[PDB]
Amino acid sequence: GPQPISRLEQCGINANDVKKLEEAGFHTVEAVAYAPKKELINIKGISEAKADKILAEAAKLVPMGFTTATEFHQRRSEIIQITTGSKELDKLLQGGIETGSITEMFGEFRTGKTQICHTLAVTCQLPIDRGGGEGKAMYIDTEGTFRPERLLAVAERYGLSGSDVLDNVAYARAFNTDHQTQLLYQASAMMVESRYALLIVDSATALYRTDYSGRGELSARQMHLARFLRMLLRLADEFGVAVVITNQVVAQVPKKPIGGNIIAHASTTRLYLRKGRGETRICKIYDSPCLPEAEAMFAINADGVGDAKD
Amino acid sequence: GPQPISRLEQCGINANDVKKLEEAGFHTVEAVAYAPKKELINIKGISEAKADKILAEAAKLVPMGFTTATEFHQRRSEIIQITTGSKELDKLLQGGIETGSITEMFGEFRTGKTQICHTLAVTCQLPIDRGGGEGKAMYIDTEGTFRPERLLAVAERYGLSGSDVLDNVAYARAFNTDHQTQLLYQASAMMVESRYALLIVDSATALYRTDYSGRGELSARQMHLARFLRMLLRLADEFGVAVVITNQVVAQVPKKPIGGNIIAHASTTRLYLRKGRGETRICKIYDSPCLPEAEAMFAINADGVGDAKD
Amino acid sequence: GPQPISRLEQCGINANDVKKLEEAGFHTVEAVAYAPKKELINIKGISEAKADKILAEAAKLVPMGFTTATEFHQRRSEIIQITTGSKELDKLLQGGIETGSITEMFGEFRTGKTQICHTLAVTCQLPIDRGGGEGKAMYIDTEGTFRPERLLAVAERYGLSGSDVLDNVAYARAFNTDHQTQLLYQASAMMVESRYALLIVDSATALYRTDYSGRGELSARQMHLARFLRMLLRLADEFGVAVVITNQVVAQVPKKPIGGNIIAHASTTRLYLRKGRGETRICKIYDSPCLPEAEAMFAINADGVGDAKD
DNA sequence: GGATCATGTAACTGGC
Numbered sequence: 001g002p003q004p005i006s007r008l009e010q011c012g013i014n015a016n017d018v019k020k021l022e023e024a025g026f027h028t029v030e031a032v033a034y035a036p037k038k039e040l041i042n043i044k045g046i047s048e049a050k051a052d053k054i055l056a057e058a059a060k061l062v063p064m065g066f067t068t069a070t071e072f073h074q075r076r077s078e079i080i081q082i083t084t085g086s087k088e089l090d091k092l093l094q095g096g097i098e099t100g101s102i103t104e105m106f107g108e109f110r111t112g113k114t115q116i117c118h119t120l121a122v123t124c125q126l127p128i129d130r131g132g133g134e135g136k137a138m139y140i141d142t143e144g145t146f147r148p149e150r151l152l153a154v155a156e157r158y159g160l161s162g163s164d165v166l167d168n169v170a171y172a173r174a175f176n177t178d179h180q181t182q183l184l185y186q187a188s189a190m191m192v193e194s195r196y197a198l199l200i201v202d203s204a205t206a207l208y209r210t211d212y213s214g215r216g217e218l219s220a221r222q223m224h225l226a227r228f229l230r231m232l233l234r235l236a237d238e239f240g241v242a243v244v245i246t247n248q249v250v251a252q253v254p255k256k257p258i259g260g261n262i263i264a265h266a267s268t269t270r271l272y273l274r275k276g277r278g279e280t281r282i283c284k285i286y287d288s289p290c291l292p293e294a295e296a297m298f299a300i301n302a303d304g305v306g307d308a309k310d
Numbered sequence: 311g312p313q314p315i316s317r318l319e320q321c322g323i324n325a326n327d328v329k330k331l332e333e334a335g336f337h338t339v340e341a342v343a344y345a346p347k348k349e350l351i352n353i354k355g356i357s358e359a360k361a362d363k364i365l366a367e368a369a370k371l372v373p374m375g376f377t378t379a380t381e382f383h384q385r386r387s388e389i390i391q392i393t394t395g396s397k398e399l400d401k402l403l404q405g406g407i408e409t410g411s412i413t414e415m416f417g418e419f420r421t422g423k424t425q426i427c428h429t430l431a432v433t434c435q436l437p438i439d440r441g442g443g444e445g446k447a448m449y450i451d452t453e454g455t456f457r458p459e460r461l462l463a464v465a466e467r468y469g470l471s472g473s474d475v476l477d478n479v480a481y482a483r484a485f486n487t488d489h490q491t492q493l494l495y496q497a498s499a500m501m502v503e504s505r506y507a508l509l510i511v512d513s514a515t516a517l518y519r520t521d522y523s524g525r526g527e528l529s530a531r532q533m534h535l536a537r538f539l540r541m542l543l544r545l546a547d548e549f550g551v552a553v554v555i556t557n558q559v560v561a562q563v564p565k566k567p568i569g570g571n572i573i574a575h576a577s578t579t580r581l582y583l584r585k586g587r588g589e590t591r592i593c594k595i596y597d598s599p600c601l602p603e604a605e606a607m608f609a610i611n612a613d614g615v616g617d618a619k620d
Numbered sequence: 621g622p623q624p625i626s627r628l629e630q631c632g633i634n635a636n637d638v639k640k641l642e643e644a645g646f647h648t649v650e651a652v653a654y655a656p657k658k659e660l661i662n663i664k665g666i667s668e669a670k671a672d673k674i675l676a677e678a679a680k681l682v683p684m685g686f687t688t689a690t691e692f693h694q695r696r697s698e699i700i701q702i703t704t705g706s707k708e709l710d711k712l713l714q715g716g717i718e719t720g721s722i723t724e725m726f727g728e729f730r731t732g733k734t735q736i737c738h739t740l741a742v743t744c745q746l747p748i749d750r751g752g753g754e755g756k757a758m759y760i761d762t763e764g765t766f767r768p769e770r771l772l773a774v775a776e777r778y779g780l781s782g783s784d785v786l787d788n789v790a791y792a793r794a795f796n797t798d799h800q801t802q803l804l805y806q807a808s809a810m811m812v813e814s815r816y817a818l819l820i821v822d823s824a825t826a827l828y829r830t831d832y833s834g835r836g837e838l839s840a841r842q843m844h845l846a847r848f849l850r851m852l853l854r855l856a857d858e859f860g861v862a863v864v865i866t867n868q869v870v871a872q873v874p875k876k877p878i879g880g881n882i883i884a885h886a887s888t889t890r891l892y893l894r895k896g897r898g899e900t901r902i903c904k905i906y907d908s909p910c911l912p913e914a915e916a917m918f919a920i921n922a923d924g925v926g927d928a929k930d
Numbered sequence: 931g932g933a934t935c936a937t938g939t940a941a942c943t944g945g946c
């Protein structure tokens with residue numbers, strides 16, 4: 001895991017400065033080592049003469065320099081992949097939902113974006129031997145569509161105790177794009193105390209359509225969204241968590257997701273879920289750096305996402 | 311219930327600013343805490359130096375941060391669900407129409423969308439022990455199809471006095487999509503004085519088809535509809551009311567509702583009502599985050615929506 | 621290849637000064653001969669009386685003066701051009717990706733910018749007879765989208781041993797625009813020990829959008845980007861390497877790359893990759909000093925970039 | 931013993 005920022009005290013930085021960084025939003029040596037000098041200068045008391053030291057001290061602990069592709073490949077092969085609850089889907093994602101990267105599943109209504117985010121909120125608590133991620137879940141909602149009774153229905157399918165599952169899911173609701181980005185700063189706090197394995201934002205773009213209405217507000221909403229998606233990338237790098245965000249679609253004037261190019265570039269995996277028949281949906285890999293563009297065929301059963309009981 | 315915005319006076323904000331917010335459309339601390347900084351800046355007198363304070367003061371009263379899924383589940387289990395007037399329907403919706411979320415029932419003509427909205431306007435006044443919601447009703451109409459004589463016919467079935475029922479239903483007619491959105495701002499006013507348990511918009515999209523005619527006006531009508539549906543979500547969150555909106559259908563060129571993706575995403579529950587035989591209709595769950603896609607079989611009797619008297 | 625800066629010791633400069641230059645960022649006589657007097661003065665110990673000598677001594681070894689266009693043309697005709705993995709693309713680039721110049725491929729998501737950078741990371745190790753570049757690869761990533769399993773899939777297609785290929789690719793991740801420019805200084809170190817044939821930055825502008833947010837920060841981000849792109853040009857001139865950088869696009873408010881004029885001028889070749897159908901993309905020459913503006917039609921197969929298997 | 935001037939980018943539905 002990541003080293004808490006209090007470790008920096010043992011290096012030459014007084015607690016007055018460290019406690020100035022924790023108030024800014026840094027609760028981990030990684031989060032400071034990743035930050036550029038410009039952000040440290042931007043703190044009310046962190047003078048230039050300090051930030052140069054803080055950065056040079058933090059870089060001593062974390063590896064910034066190069067490495068051969070072998071160490072990366074060997075380390076990457078040990079990355080956790082949370083099971084989706086569907087053998088057909090994991091066969092498509094080659095194991096499951098990666099961690100340390102941003103996955104985005106978009107699709108027309110009813111296609112089960114919130115349902116996948118609900119099983120993932122549970123299976124991410126399974127032991128690694130069972131495909132899970134061995135950690136708590138973190139569910140930021142922007143719709144009011146968080147239904148814990150759907151967490152129990154899948155918790156019982158996997159044998160876990162419904163009591164503990166509803167205790168290892170930290171829920172919060174965003175009421176506007178400002179609160180939504182603010183909950184991420186409070187998220188970095190909680191993520192250094194307990195171990196989280198999955199952070200969910202559902203939906204990641206639902207509030208941006210309405211908070212920025214005028215045609216002149218469009219360039220400002222994509223840039224506010226860009227910082228939000230970058231904040232999400234910082235949590236994945238620093239905490240080794242798995243970020244799953246949910247998008248919405250729009251008609252090409254056939255379905256095409258919203259958010260624009262800023263979200264299509266930032267996302268590493270895009271899953272396009274369309275409805276098939278009855279309760280069986282069709283997930284297709286829209287974008288990925290390693291998976292071939294293919295399709296699967298999962299379902300939405302009374303016990304969460306599963307396979308098409310045909 | 312929600313705290314009126316005058317409570318904010320006891321914190322450091324002068325009445326000149328509070329009375330500037332009430333003129334904007336905020337009559338509740340929640341409605342201010344949910345609003346983003348951008349909207350407060352947009353008021354004629356609320357400078358940046360104030361909005362940062364107003365937001366930071368309002369957030370002290372209402373909970374914005376995280377919480378475990380247990381507190382949510384325990385609190386969610388105590389949510390009110392208004393009876394539909396049909397045992398078969400409540401068995402489908404698992405208790406009745408939820409509050410604090412947007413329910414949408416669409417369907418071909420005659421299929422009883424206005425009739426369901428008429429019984430709901432009455433049963434939402436029943437005591438909670440009888441399945442109701444213990445509160446007044448709020449009926450925005452965009453068709454002229456509000457018939458109070460149908461409110462009496464169901465008021466007498468439930469034993470309530472027809473006099474009081476027609477006194478606890480606040481009716482208003484929208485003549486265009488602008489007036490329709492304007493009535494919501496006057497709705498937040500009335501909802502903080504009295505206690506409302508149900509807000510109805512029938513129909514929610516009937517006026518959008520005609521107010522925006524040209525093919526180039528389509529992107530502007532979906533965005534005006536997006537703000538309207540977001541205004542509806544703010545009332546459900548802030549006032550804990552139950553929003554029921556009515557849609558229309560169109561032929562796939564078999565029935566498919568209008569409004570597009572902006573209304574399908576925003577709605578949490580979509581009910582598809584088709585005609586069966588005689589006076590018996592068939593409600594089917596088109597979209598929901600917790601209910602399985604099933605069907606029921608209600609009817610339209612002389613005393614409102616009921617069960618198929620077979 | 622380029623002469624290491626220790627060769628300058630055999631001329632009249634003491635090791636104290638040379639070791640002062642290597643700490644600055646010069647590890648090659650060329651890199652010193654190219655540097656202006658102003659930069660040498662800027663070192664903590666290199667007085668004016670030294671820099672004039674160091675420059676005049678370095679210029680004795682490397683050719684700075686004029687030459688006829690014949691020697692250049694004869695020498696230019698012997699420049700290496702790394703194969704893209706697609707016969708259709710090499711026919712467009714007339715042989716492949718040039719070395720000693722900055723190539724930039726931009727395009728909407730999914731269009732295979734990271735995939736091209738992945739095959740190029742492998743084929744640049746092929747012997748020159750097979751179209752490669754006979755050298756190691758250098759992959760600076762700013763997205764976390766470096767997938768070594770895609771390096772193996774193309775390594776096996778070309779018969780090379782997957783073990784050695786993942787040993788000749790030096791990977792590093794940039795977490796902000798400061799670290800990104802810092803990795804170039806550590807790159808000049810490694811490039812004088814081993815022989816590199818290709819340096820990759822993917823993406824070259826992804827971090828600049830977010831690190832500089834305010835409208836007033838725009839003039840400072842283009843200038844920080846200008847130095848970065850100049851650092852890239854110094855590596856191409858001094859080390860004879862091939863620099864391939866990846867850009868992102870934005871909507872004209874159809875696709876137009878970001879970075880502004882500073883990156884459009886600095887780039888010598890700009891390739892515009894759009895999606896065609898299925899797995900077949902379309903690369904078009906946006907800017908080049910010698911190639912006509914044409915298009916090709918490659919693909920993204922399970923073994924990397926290739927030709928459209930039609 | 932004794933004063934003085936100059937530049938630089940960025941998305942979005944609707945029957946017979």
Ligand SMILES: Nc1ncnc2c1ncn2[C@@H]1O[C@H](COP(=O)(O)OP(=O)(O)OP(=O)(O)O)[C@@H](O)[C@H]1O
Nearest residue numbers: 109110111112113114115302575599600601602603
């Ligand atoms: N308990 C359940 N058992 C079976 N199916 C269910 C259950 N709860 C919901 N569903 C089904 O799951 C689907 C709802 O999916 P979900 O709520 O994830 O959609 P979504 O992509 O979030 O949509 P939107 O854009 O409207 O928010 C519907 O088909 C619904 O019938």
Ligand SMILES: Nc1ncnc2c1ncn2[C@@H]1O[C@H](COP(=O)(O)OP(=O)(O)OP(=O)(O)O)[C@@H](O)[C@H]1O
Nearest residue numbers: 417418419420421422423424425426610611612613
């Ligand atoms: N008093 C009544 N007793 C019995 N049935 C009635 C009564 N009033 C209306 N109905 C029936 O209810 C149906 C009308 O339903 P309703 O007005 O809710 O339709 P709707 O979905 O709003 O339609 P539209 O799209 O045309 O507005 C018809 O079948 C009509 O015969």
Ligand SMILES: Nc1ncnc2c1ncn2[C@@H]1O[C@H](COP(=O)(O)OP(=O)(O)OP(=O)(O)O)[C@@H](O)[C@H]1O
Nearest residue numbers: 265289290291292293729730731732733734735922
């Ligand atoms: N192993 C594979 N086999 C076949 N196709 C693949 C494979 N891995 C990825 N792809 C395809 O390659 C494309 C991804 O391209 P790439 O990752 O290079 O895009 P990009 O230009 O970097 O995008 P972005 O801006 O999102 O980073 C997708 O169409 C994906 O389906």
Ligand SMILES: [Ca+2]
Nearest residue numbers: 113114143145
């Ligand atoms: Ca949802």
Ligand SMILES: [Ca+2]
Nearest residue numbers: 264265267268
């Ligand atoms: Ca992407």
Ligand SMILES: [Ca+2]
Nearest residue numbers: 423424453455
């Ligand atoms: Ca009606």
Ligand SMILES: [Ca+2]
Nearest residue numbers: 574575577578
């Ligand atoms: Ca919905």
Ligand SMILES: [Ca+2]
Nearest residue numbers: 733734763765
């Ligand atoms: Ca990429």
Ligand SMILES: [Ca+2]
Nearest residue numbers: 884885887888
């Ligand atoms: Ca150029």
